[PDB]
Amino acid sequence: VLPNTALKTSIQHVGMINGRKLIKFETRNEDDVVVLTGEAEIEQPVTTFVFTGQGSQEQGMGMDLYKTSKAAQDVWNRADNHFKDTYGFSILDIVINNPVNLTIHFGGEKGKRIRENYSAMIFETIVDGKLKTEKIFKEINEHSTSYTFRSEKGLLSATQFTQPALTLMEKAAFEDLKSKGLIPADATFAGHSLGEYAALASLADVMSIESLVEVVFYRGMTMQVAVPRDELGRSNYGMIAINPGRVAASFSQEALQYVVERVGKRTGWLVEIVNYNVENQQYVAAGDLRALDTVTNVLNFIKLQKIDIIELQKSLSLEEVEGHLFEIIDEASKKSAVKPRPLKLERGFACIPLVGISVPFHSTYLMNGVKPFKSFLKKNIIKENVKVARLAGKYIPNLTAKPFQVTKEYFQDVYDLTGSEPIKEIIDNWEKYEQS
């Protein structure tokens, strides 16, 4: 009831969501009343979500939310229904209790469950870290009663059950916020190298959860078994990290480069200026710790270049390969992680592996620019034009699809961007196994 001068009273309350959070409040009066309802608007802050980084393994893992959100509930029931029809067991039992090292042995009884299980969905997995026709981790011959998994630190480990676990929890957990509607329409596609999958598995998803947990468990097996090594059990790879080291930032980018001239290693995923990963090749870490423990003996950016490195380092790296055969890491102004994997050394280990797995299920009719902000790793946002970094990553299909094309048409709709993206996002997913 609009007019002029003598004023009013009010109230204030933070209500809704829709996409944002709204702001529900009305006003009293020069009669403590109301005649134009209540202000609404939308209280939206800076949209920046994130996903995991696969170092958060433990027993519990969001099981309180499992009963809480009904949206998460059937989602949690989904893959456990689904993947047991792939491979009979309860994934939700894995997170309820760790099957400590006596894990599930998969009874898989002689009746017609066998042809779904003691059958297809296993041994069709293949690796290519050796010569290519290398089917995965056998005794899934014709009968194969009761194949077992075994992990000596609890089952929820070995990067074979850890990978489907965390992408199941948070994708369900993210949906709870999408249940309550607490995310804006355009946001951040933030995850870390498998949480990037659960950015694609989450918001602007193109796959199903069932398809997700398949290919996650695919690469979960694949990232484990890449090293044919030491049949009692170990492998000669690994991962370490370090702080800035009496100043830094490409301090070691040439130093390790003089060691990859010799033996073989990489940088890991370069997450911070404080924080860097280094893939180990066991003698590498027993080598370059000695190489870097002389650096903390004070030597700053001083006198001239090219008169230099590993001559002081190869006195010590080759010194310790003979002190014991399978060496070990240490501390000494550094620390070690724990795997036998890599993040780039596998390199071409995917493709005929991973993309061939990704060839099934994934692409064709897979949304549009709902994910035009899909910043995957080793890139800078998801934009379809001249993504030339494809050539600077892996120009396999990204060449025939590139140079021969370069606007195949005049960039039409339908799938001209999308099927191109269906290659490209898969291609974005392609070297994600490697390319640290």
DSSP 165-178: HHHHHHHHHHHHHH
Nearest C-alpha neighbor of 240 from the set 288, 178, 304: 288
Q: Is the CB of residue 278 less than 8 Å from the CB of residue 256?
A: yes
Give strand pairing partners of 241: 277, 335
Q: 249-284 burial by CB neighbour count: b if 16+ within 10 A, else e?
A: eebbeebbebbeeebebbbbbeeeeeebbbbbbbbb
Q: Which whole-number Å values give the CA distances from 21 to 71, 174, 323, in the listed order?
A: 20, 17, 64
Residues 6+ apart with CB under 8 A from 213: 79, 82, 83, 91, 164, 167, 168
Q: What angle do CA 175, 369, 355 make, to 5 degrees?
A: 80
Tokens of 341: 């994997």
Q: Backbone phi, then psi, for 38, in 5-degree steps?
A: -160, 140
d(CA 242, CA 173): 32
Which one, of 247, 250, 329, 252, lies nearest residue 283 by Cα? Answer: 329
Residues 6+ apart with CB under 8 A from 238: 279, 280, 281, 282, 285, 329, 336, 337, 338, 339, 340
β-bridge mates for residue 150, sequence order: 102
The experimental technique behind this entry is cryo-EM
Tokens for 20, please give them: 């944002």
**CB 172, CB 178: distance < 8 Å:** no
Q: Confirm if 29 and 47 have CB atoms less than 8 A apart.
A: no
Decide if 180 contacts 15 (C-beta within 8 A): no
Do β-strands 126-127 and 237-242 pair in parallel, antiparallel, or remain unpaired? Answer: unpaired
Please give the order of strands across the beta sheet that includes 276-281. 276-281, 237-242, 335-336
> Do residues 295 and 245 make contact, with C-beta atoms less than 8 angstroms apart?
yes
∠ CA 360-365-366, rounded to 5°: 85
Phi-psi map region of 293: left, alpha, beta (phi>0 left; psi -120 to 50 alpha) = alpha
Give, as one character, the DSSP assignment of residue 347. G
Q: Which two tokens stand for residue 163?
A: 């990978």
Residue 135 φ/ψ, nearest 5 degrees: -75, 155
Angle at the Cα of 414 (from 376 to 18), degrees rounded to 5? Answer: 60
CA-CA distance, 154 to 165, in Å (whole number)?
14
Mapped onto helix, strand or coil, the DSSP state of residue 180 is helix
| DSSP-based three-state secondary structure for 378 | coil
- Do residues 337 and 331 make contact, with C-beta atoms less than 8 angstroms apart? no
For the beta carbon of residue 27, count every other beta carbon within 10 angstroms: 17
List residues bridging with 39 in a β-sheet.
25
Q: Could you give the CA distance from residue 415 to residue 366 in angstroms, rounded to a whole number?
A: 9
Give the whole-angstrom CA distance, residue 310 versus residue 259.
7
Q: Which residues contact 262 (CB under 8 A, 6 or more apart)?
A: 310, 314, 317
Q: Quick one: which of 391, 380, 393 has its CA closest to 434?
A: 393
Residues in CB range of 390: below 8 A, 6 or more apart: 398, 402, 424, 427
* Residue 329 structure tokens: 């890491």
Q: What is the token pair recorded at 159?
A: 């990067």
Which of 167, 173, 219, 172 is closest to 198 using CA atoms? 167
Q: How far is CA 165 from CA 58, 160, 202, 222, 322, in A?
A: 10, 9, 15, 16, 40
> Is residue 28 classed as helix, strand or coil in its secondary structure?
coil
Q: Which two tokens stand for residue 427?
A: 């291609």
CA-based R_g, the chain, Å:
27
Amino acid (one-letter) located at 186: D
Would you say 111 and 118 are in contact if contact means Cβ atoms under 8 Å apart?
no
CA-wise closest residue to 428 among 200, 215, 217, 210: 200
Q: What is the DSSP string of 188-221?
A: ----STTTTHHHHSSSS--S-HHHHHHHHHHHHH
CB atoms within 10 A of CB 351: 17
CA distances from 334 to 36, 256, 393 (A): 66, 15, 30
Of 74, 78, 110, nearest to 91 by C-alpha is 78
- Record the tokens describing residue 223, joined without a space: 């990232």
Q: Estimate the share of the chain in helix, then strand, then coil, as percent rounded to the nearest 5.
A: 25, 5, 65
* Whole-number Cα distances in Å, 224 to 157, 219, 341, 346, 416: 11, 8, 6, 11, 37
Q: Which helix or strand (DSSP H or E) is residue 242 part of?
A: strand 237-242
Residues in Cβ contact with 13 at an 8 Å cutoff, skipping those fewer than 6 apart: 23, 24, 25
Give Cα 263 to chain centroid, integer Å.
Answer: 28
What are residue 70's phi and psi, to 5 degrees? -70, -30
Alpha helix stretches (DSSP H) within 294-419: 314-320, 354-358, 397-400
Q: By the 8 A CB rule, do 180 and 17 touch?
A: yes
Structure tokens at 118: 């003691």
Residue 235: HSE in the Cβ half-sphere, 13 Å Cα cutoff: 18
